[PDB]
Amino acid sequence: EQKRAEFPRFTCVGPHLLEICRWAHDPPSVVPHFQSGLFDSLSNVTFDRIDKTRMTEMFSQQNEKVEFERPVDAKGNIEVWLQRLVDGMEDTVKQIIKRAVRNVAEMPLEDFVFGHPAQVSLLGIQFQWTAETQMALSSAKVDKTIMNKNMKKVDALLRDMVNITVRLDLTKNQRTNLETCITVHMHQKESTEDLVKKKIKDPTDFEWLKQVRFYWRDDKDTVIISICDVDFEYSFEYLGVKERLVITPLTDICYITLSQALGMFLGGAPAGPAGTGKTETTKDLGNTLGKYVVVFNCSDQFDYTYMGKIYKGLAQSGLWGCFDEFNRINLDVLSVCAQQVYCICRTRERKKSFQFTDGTTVSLDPRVGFFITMNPGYAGAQELPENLKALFRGVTMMVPNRQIIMKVKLAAAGYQENDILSKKFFVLYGLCEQQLSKQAHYDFGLRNILSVLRTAGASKRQSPDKSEVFLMMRTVRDMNMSKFVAEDVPLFLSLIDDLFPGLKADATRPDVNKDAEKVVLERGLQVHPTWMNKCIQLYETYLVRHGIMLVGPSGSGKSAICECLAAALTELGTKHVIWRMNPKAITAPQMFGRRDDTTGDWTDGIFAVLWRRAAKNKNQNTWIVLDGPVDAIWIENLNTVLDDNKVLTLANGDRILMSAAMKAMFEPENLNNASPATVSRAGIIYVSDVELGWEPPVKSWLQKRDPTEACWARLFSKYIDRMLEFVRISLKPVMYNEQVSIVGTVMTLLNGYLKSMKEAGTAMNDAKYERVFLYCMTWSLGGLLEMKERPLFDQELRTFAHNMPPKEEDSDTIFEFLVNTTDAEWLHLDSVRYGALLNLSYNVDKATLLVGGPGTAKTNTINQFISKFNAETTANKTITFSSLTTPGIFQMSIEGAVEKRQGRTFGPPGGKQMCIFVDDISMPYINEWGHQVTNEIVRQLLEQGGMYSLEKPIGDMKFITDVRYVAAMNTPGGGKNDIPNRLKRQFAIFNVPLPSVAAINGIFG
Amino acid sequence: GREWIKNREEANQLKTTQLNDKLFRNHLEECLAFGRPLLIENIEEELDPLLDPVLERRLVKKGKTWVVPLADKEVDFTETFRLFCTTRLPNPHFTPELSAKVTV
Amino acid sequence: LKGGAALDINSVRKKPKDWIPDLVWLNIIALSAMDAFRDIPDSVFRNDGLWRQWYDQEAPEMAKVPDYEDRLNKFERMCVVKTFREDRTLIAAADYIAEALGQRFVESVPLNMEKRPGRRAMAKCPLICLLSPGPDPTKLIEDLAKKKKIKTLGVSMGQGQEVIARKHMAAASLEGHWVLLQNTHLGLGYLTEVETFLVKEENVHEDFRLWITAEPHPQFPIGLLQMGIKITNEAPVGIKAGLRASYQWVNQDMLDMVSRQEWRQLLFVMCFLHSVVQEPQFGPIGWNVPYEFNQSDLSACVQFLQNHLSEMDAKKAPQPTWETVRYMISAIQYGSRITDDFDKLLMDTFAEKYFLQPVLQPSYELFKDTRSSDGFSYRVPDSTDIETFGSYIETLPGTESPEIFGLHPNADITFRTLQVQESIVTILDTMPKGAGSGSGLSREDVVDKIPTLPLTVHLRQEIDRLNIVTRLTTTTLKNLALAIAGTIAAERGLIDALDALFNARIPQQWLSKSWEASTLGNWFTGLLQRYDQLNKWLNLGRPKAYWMTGFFNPQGFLTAMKQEVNRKHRDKWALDDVVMSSEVTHRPKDFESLKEGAPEGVYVYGLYLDLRLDGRENRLMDSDPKKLFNPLPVLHVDGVLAKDKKRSGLYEAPKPYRVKARKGLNFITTFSVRTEDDKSKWILPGVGILCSID
Amino acid sequence: HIKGLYKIAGFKGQPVYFIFTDAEVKDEGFLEYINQILMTGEVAGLLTKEDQDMIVNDIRPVMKHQAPGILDTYDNLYNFFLNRVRDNLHVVLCFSPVGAKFARRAQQFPGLINGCTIDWFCPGPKKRLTSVSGKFIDKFTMACPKEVKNQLELLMGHAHVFVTAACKEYFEKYRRYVYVTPKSYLSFLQGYKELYAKKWSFTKEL
């Protein structure tokens, strides 16, 4: 405390003083934050390179090389040469400003911005502007000419700075300098123009007086700043850049209010919505005066003694400080410390002793001033004692106006139509957030606005000599629709035409189209126009980010979309291979790389090793694809690689920046649980199921299987899609329908019979084709009916003339008499029908799924056909998902089925095949997000044949060799959980109702 | 009622606690073991099933070398001892089993 | 005590329909179940002239019961009152209390600290004074402690650091004194230590009394307030209180600076005006929200006024630039505490009308409208002394006509109502604590109510939200008709809603809008019509009796009008130059076309204004605005611009979501209405456009 | 524990029995093992390689009795073992009707009811109270003929009926509810007679 008294500046930092005292010899050894403890932008000082005794120039946190009026031999007492430095910055300010005004004329004006520090140039600009603007009045003199020429003084230099911004040779220091100056110059305009809109009156008209002005009165030495009744002087502390904000009418209101707060010697209390620049305006105005503000956290233990300590330096050096979350200080403490500092406050009143638990004597600097922010004003006040509100004057906040911010940004981005551009762009966002369908991915917050505007400014800077309207139109149309659902795109473009008539969109590289055309049909898949358009959109987003995402309903093959994309890329020598990890199936604590609560062991992250390779695996470029539902729990530390940081924190940040080689892809069937601040830091690509509809994959098979027969094309929707929609609307299934999966069941059953007749000499015909077509979709559409709803499927269908037992009599229906693979008869318990299906499933060794009786007869049914695997070395690991079956249960139960190669690979001994049977798999309880993590493992190992480590924190290849499955569950309903759609596409699905009352009588009699 | 019974048995070492108290873990035993009437406050606020063992009297009701009987108090312990259940929830909800075991 | 639940669905009271609002028909329907009033509708029909004046809004006692003495006693008299008048309610209730057990029960008793400063306050009885925000009853304690000459061991709470208070608490208790514990409500924890000290403070000297300057807080020691004696005190309501306090707020020599006498004169009206702005707490006809009417406002204000008029002396009239004088008070001093644009502009309206060059005339004019209890019209008492100005002030009371705030005679009656609803609501909050509930299922049948435009988009979204709320409501209708019926009576999270159901309130989850709880039946009919509009727009391309307030989003539909505009008006153009255009009560233009610059709003039916327009002009303060609120059948709207439009003849009446912008700020819009006079005139009323009344 | 019970049931071929009440339940792991018992006829997954090479050597000679014909594979041996295990177990759960989780526990194991039978209680009628009181009234002294015992048991059954009826009126007039159990009636029966012992004795003393 004695040393804090020795030097009021020291009173800011905490225990750092000891370290400060440790330094006794070398000011060069002194480095921030010690150099940042009192100075807002200073970081370094340089000395006489032959002796390092005369301080030549300095360096800043703003990275500014600035000399001094005289190199001060500042090597005496540490705190004493601290003043020997402090005086230097204000001396330099005064003298550099003096020569700045002198060489407004003595030297040129464009370099006047660049021949001077950022704020040094800014204050010179303000001086010249204020001089002319008062001399515009000058008596209220009757000559419009001078105000008119001031109009173009502001405007022409504004467009010159537009040219400076668009020219691509500005150093980040000077770039930021000029960009900050842009906003100052728009405010200078706004003021000077509003002068003209008002009646031009005398230099002492309160309209003029009401605004801030800057009169460098070297009649003593220095500038004096006039605000609407009163005058001050700039602090002259070197502030580097301190990029300012936009200036609102509210800004002027606050300026005047807080200026008068000094008149009553009272504090200012900015109250308003949280996170609305409440402290930002205070800091910016302090810098506009030069005051080194020190923010103060509240709602803590709030050591009132320590604030009593800092009040010494506050009353002594007259600087400022701001408080935040003041109202949530501990209630009893919120009163104790409030009263304690309340007593201290009155030392302002020309007094020189602040009284506290110290009750000590100080000096008074009139420059001191107190400001406090906190949680948003609640109904007109806060949870604060009613004496500070007496000591303070409130200041009303309200959400800033986006239009003005966009105007100043675009002007800084070199735009001149900018104003009228915003006058439609803000309205456009308002409409988009009003009319259209609203979901989480739909975001139009400030983040969206900054993101679009920064990109558009660069676009124009690299597409110059171009109309602003066209560039703005192409940008806004381009970066929006892909994120959005289809049906809003017509509405989107309609609003576009409203706010932009007589314009047109952009074009992209067409050569990517032809490569996909080649590969898709070349690999037998279906190429589709809208699908191709989305491929182009993905290629576009591929050039703006590295992390993109594919949201949409399952069965769309978003897998296949990025497969075709990577194939087409590698067609042109740009490799991008993928690895399909499940970001939820394997365990979350190993997902990312996290920190323990005991010591923080490097218990690795599943992607930590993969990102380690991404730092140490360099032969090409690749992709890293993650399929599965997306929480917020393996992402909250992920945007660091995709936002404006580009380095992924493994668990603390592992320095591995934007990997030019590998990228992160995601395929969530529904991305709906990320905050709209986490959202839009990825490549938001909505995809509708229409882009590869029902029929295009069937035509893909037309390409693949023999069209020599071309069987389904005979009734390609003439039998299918009509009944599809008819049952989907007029009938009520007991299960969700993803029609890609249903047509998959139809085609898979058809191919099962195709294999049955093409590997066995069992015969073939065309009426054979018609009836196998009827029977391969009837259950594919009967798999969601009951004994009273299958007849409804039958009291509709007689519009075809292909022989059926329904065409035979009324009691018997299609299922009751099956078809034969040889002569196509109708043969006259139930299990066998499913078993052949299972065998047909066994033909492709791809399971189906069953719902209904809870182990009632399905246990009786399925096991009889599971029995018939004998020579495959089939290890019938019947693994049923139980009351609480964890993904680890499946992990080991199939690890038990096979050999654990390498400890990080899972395949059977050699390649011996086995069957895996699950009685119920929808049984396990979901978590609150609504998904059985114990199930996405099943999808991942069905599709990829590999996986990373839910066992090991490291996260590494575990290749899943050949397998086959059969599984079932109970019916969806009250209490019973259901299955993720992307898992549902992997398996067929059919319903097991109450069985055959007639066969009940048979089997039991 | 807690106050009335306090006046009734404070001289008789009316040891008091409530199930939330970790001292109860031993307040139960010695007050049992010394025959000192136990008091418990906020019963349905702090209902714990561990009461039922002693409410069913582990160190089983039957015995003489283990459980000396009583002929002075209408309670289920070896020594002059009762437990009391005082509430400030006016109309709680009750289990049938504890209502049967313990009267109201 | 109950306004009823089923009042509107029942055929609007048929016989008496001449001079009578519909809500009254509902109320008399609810009453008629009364056994002292069974034939009441038929009677009030046949003989109705006295009942007609009964609803010519006679104040009491001019509202003196129609003497149908066959069923007429005092309790029945309040029944008549409440069913009919909401100003006579409290008066008739007090009359009944007097007729029961004398007026001495309704007669007020002066508040003062003399009945038990120790006379009934035992040494074991601490004394606590529940201060209202404002006055400190410390002065009575000071006078007692300087007549008794007792030691006054004052100590400031709001800080537990005063462990030293215990030594005071020692001498206060052990030695025996009258001890001051000021600001005790600021502290919360040292309260417990004081409490546990006091529960044993019955072994000390006799003079031990406590004097706890605190404000009641729900989080405070129950036992500590139980042991002692509680005495609450309220500020003296009245302008004069604020005026004299502002005088003592200023130094009496500062109140006597004739060197800037005009400024001194200014002080009085400033001393005046800060009281006036403090008065209106009667929203929305008062303010949009309450605010800090503190005197640090006044202190900074007068300080800066002295600054202004000391720059160049107060005797020099040109120097105070009254635009700046308004600016200091408005933009910065007061508006910073203010948060609402309309409240801000109302206060600015105060600023210009009370700040101007011709204010310095001696005995300047403040209120000539007011013929007061003495008929006096308010002016400036130009005689330099605090005593002189104050004395002039108590010559007139603080109770005056609301018009002085730009209000209307209706406003006083509205305050009477406000008291009636708040009181009866509290009474219904306390009665069932000794009555019980449960009556069997209240089986009611309202669940049984179940081209391409962006207008149809709004349609469809409305259908979605109404379907949602309809079925969510139906859930609990089952959870009542099927819980105690079909064994579902085993869940209690929702039962509070069903308790508000059997007791006429509207629970929380079903705020399908910002509906105010009046009856179940009213909101049921509301939602019924809300779905019926969607029914019609399904069966009609666009209904022509379009009732706006059945919607769930006004912003969507008003914007929908605007993109229709752009579709055909700014066809070939953009929304960048389109602004709203408002019609008038007597429909000036309804449909003429739909293309560029044409009628493409909709017939917005039923907008409410306690102000009424005929001859295309607006009338206020009369008996019709005095009647609660004035309906508006229909007017139209459109959107156009690209050319300056001057609402010079049109007031900018705001239109919020519901009956009070005061109770919350969803300001739907602002409209232009043809006022044949100045608009600032209407600002002091500030009559906004209201979606609907109940 | 379950290993030994398996041995007694399966290996010994001795029919065993097992009671699992509402109290010993802790986790869905326990309920899940009971699930395995109910459906698989075994604690599924918990019969391990130790059980494998145990039963392989164990059962064979015992199996030579009912099915002397060998099916040397552990398949049929373990099949017959499991058949007998199901034949013998009879796991039971007598549970509380108002089990706070019992409904949701059945939600956690659906087949909890799909592997058993359901029988409700409906506590005893007037006859039950008459029967129970009949012993105790005849266990005590009197100054009355026999039929007075029938009158006493009849009136006590009446009394419990009245308790029930008045409890219903309580459930109606107020919305608070009370519990009357058979255990309550037995506590009544013992308390009445124990106090009546003293009263009879002391009146006889006077």
Collapse the DSSP code of C174 into the 3-class scheme (helix H, G, I; strand E, B; otherwise coil) and give the result: helix
Of the candidates A965, A747, A969, A994, the residue with the CA atom closest to the CA atom of residue A838: A965
Tokens of B35: 């025959």
Q: Is A619 on the interface with C (CB under 8 A)?
A: no
Asked if the Cβ–Cβ distance from C570 to A339 is below 8 Å, we say no
Kind and range of the H or E run holding C27: helix C22-32
Chains that touch B (3 or more CB pairs under 8 A): D
Max Cα separation, chain C?
Answer: 93
- What is the three-state SS of C434-478? HCCCCCCCCCCCCHHHCCCCHHHHHHHHHHHHHHHHHHHHHHHHH
Place of tokens 């005689």: C383
Chains that touch A (3 or more CB pairs under 8 A): C, D
Collapse the DSSP code of B88 into the 3-class scheme (helix H, G, I; strand E, B; otherwise coil) and give the result: coil
DSSP output for A530-556: HHHHHHHHHHHHTTT-S-EEEE--TTS
Q: What is the dihedral of CA A818, A819, A825, A831, to 10 degrees?
A: -30
Q: Is D79 on the interface with A (CB under 8 A)?
A: no
Distances (CA, A) of A958 to A303, A902, A952, A954: 55, 9, 11, 12
Q: How many CB pairs under 8 A join A and C?
A: 122
DSSP tag of D126: H
Collapse the DSSP code of A928 into the 3-class scheme (helix H, G, I; strand E, B; otherwise coil) and give the result: coil
In chain B, DSSP finds a helix count (H) and a strand count (E) of 4, 3
> Do A284 and A244 meet the contact criterion of CB atoms below 8 Å apart?
yes
List, in sequence order, every beta strand (DSSP E) within chain D: 18-19, 91-92
Distances (CA, A) of A17 to A10, A12, A509, B92, C352: 7, 9, 62, 61, 56
Name every residue whose Cβ is closer than 8 Å to that of residue A914 and which is 6 or more positions away in sequence. A869, A872, A873, A874, A875, A876, A877, A897, A898, A908, A963, A964
Which of A855, A883, A919 is closest, CB to CB, to D108? A883
Chains that touch D (3 or more CB pairs under 8 A): A, B
Tokens of A87: 């005086």
Helix C409-430 to helix C88-101 angle (10° resolution) is 50
Q: Which positions 530-559 of C are in contact with A (Cβ < 8 Å)?
A: 555-556, 559
Least Cα separation, residue A834 to chain D (angstroms): 22
Amino acid, single-letter form, for residue C21: P
Residues in chain D within 8 Å Cβ distance of B104 = 178
- Measured CA to CA, the distance from residue A326 to residue A296 in angstroms comes to 9
Q: What is the dihedral of CA D133, D134, D139, D143, to 10 degrees?
A: 100
- Measured CA to CA, the distance from residue A917 to residue D83 in angstroms comes to 21
Q: Is D110 on the interface with A (CB under 8 A)?
A: yes
Amino acid, single-letter form, for residue A258: L
Residue-wise over A947-963: b if at least 16 C-beta within 10 A, else e? bbbbbbbbbbebebbeb
Max Cα separation, chain D?
Answer: 87
Q: How many CB pairs under 8 A join A and D?
A: 31
Tokens of A86: 């402090």
- Measured CA to CA, the distance from residue A383 to residue A378 in angstroms comes to 9
- Measured CA to CA, the distance from residue D84 to residue D90 in angstroms comes to 11
| Measured CA angle at D115 (ends D114, D116), to 5 deg | 100
> Do C89 and C422 meet the contact criterion of CB atoms below 8 Å apart?
no
Tokens of C686: 């500030």
DSSP tag of B46: G
| Measured CA angle at A537 (ends A535, A543), to 5 deg | 110
Kind and range of the H or E run holding D142: none
Collapse the DSSP code of C630 into the 3-class scheme (helix H, G, I; strand E, B; otherwise coil) and give the result: strand
Which residue of chain B has the CA closest to D186? B100
> Do A421 and A410 meet the contact criterion of CB atoms below 8 Å apart?
yes
Of the candidates A654, A681, A781, the residue with the CA atom closest to the CA atom of residue A730: A781
Amino acid, single-letter form, for residue C245: A
The radius of gyration of chain D from alpha carbons, rounded to an integer in Å, stands at 27
- Provide the 10 A C-beta neighbour count for residue A601: 10
Q: Which positions 252-291 of C are in contact with A (Cβ < 8 Å)?
A: 289-291
Q: Is A253 on the interface with C (CB under 8 A)?
A: yes
Is residue D121 classed exposed, middle or buried when 0-12, 13-18 and 19+ CB atoms within 10 A define those classes?
exposed
Which of C189, C292, C307 is closest, CB to CB, to A389? C292
Q: Is B1 on the interface with D (CB under 8 A)?
A: no
Asked if the Cβ–Cβ distance from A880 to D44 is below 8 Å, we say yes
Asked if the Cβ–Cβ distance from A970 to D110 is below 8 Å, we say yes
Backbone angles phi, psi at C604, to 5 degrees: -70, 110
> Do C231 and C128 meet the contact criterion of CB atoms below 8 Å apart?
yes
Distances (CA, A) of A400 to A252, A277, A375, A377, A397: 13, 9, 17, 16, 9
Q: A557: phi > 0 → left, psi -120 to 50 → alpha, else beta; which?
A: left
Distances (CA, A) of C54 to C16, C88, C211: 13, 12, 51
Tokens of A591: 């997902």
- Measured CA to CA, the distance from residue A531 to residue A561 in angstroms comes to 8
DSSP output for D71-114: --SHHHHHHHHHHHHHHH--EE----TT-TTHHHHHHHSGGGTT
Alpha carbon C439 to its chain centroid, in Å, reads 35
Would you mind telling me the total number of residues written for chain B in this entry? 104
Residues in chain C within 8 Å Cβ distance of A260 = 300, 304, 328, 332-333
Which of A257, A380, A423 is closest, CB to CB, to C339? A380
> Do C7 and C522 meet the contact criterion of CB atoms below 8 Å apart?
yes
> Do A934 and A628 meet the contact criterion of CB atoms below 8 Å apart?
no
Alpha carbon C398 to its chain centroid, in Å, reads 20
Backbone angles phi, psi at C500, to 5 degrees: -65, -20
> Do C692 and C628 meet the contact criterion of CB atoms below 8 Å apart?
no
- Measured CA to CA, the distance from residue A668 to residue A880 in angstroms comes to 27
Amino acid, single-letter form, for residue C679: K
What contacts 24+ positions apart, CB below 8 Å, involve C502-510? C502/C437, C502/C438, C502/C439, C502/C442, C503/C428, C503/C432, C503/C437, C504/C2, C504/C3, C504/C4, C504/C5, C509/C472, C510/C469, C510/C472, C510/C473
Max Cα separation, chain A?
Answer: 120
> Do C612 and C618 meet the contact criterion of CB atoms below 8 Å apart?
yes
Q: Say whether the D–B interface has 3 or more Cβ pairs within 8 Å.
A: yes
> Do A756 and A840 meet the contact criterion of CB atoms below 8 Å apart?
yes
Least Cα separation, residue A877 to chain D (angstroms): 10
Which residue of chain A has the CA closest to C344? A396
Characterize the bridge pairing of strands C229-233 and A548-551: unpaired
Q: Is D1 on the interface with B (CB under 8 A)?
A: no
Of the candidates A750, A690, A692, the residue with the CA atom closest to the CA atom of residue A720: A750
Residues in chain D within 8 Å Cβ distance of A883 = 28, 31-32, 35, 108-109
- Measured CA to CA, the distance from residue A246 to residue A186 in angstroms comes to 9
Characterize the bridge pairing of strands C209-214 and C579-582: unpaired
Asked if the Cβ–Cβ distance from A380 to C289 is below 8 Å, we say yes
Method: cryo-EM
| Measured CA angle at C387 (ends C382, C392), to 5 deg | 55
Of the candidates A984, A994, A433, the residue with the CA atom closest to the CA atom of residue A736: A984
Q: Is A383 on the interface with C (CB under 8 A)?
A: no
Q: Is C332 on the interface with A (CB under 8 A)?
A: yes
> Do A13 and A20 meet the contact criterion of CB atoms below 8 Å apart?
yes
Residues in chain B within 8 Å Cβ distance of D179 = 94-96, 99-100
Is there a binding annotation on residue A278? yes
- Measured CA to CA, the distance from residue A959 to residue A764 in angstroms comes to 40
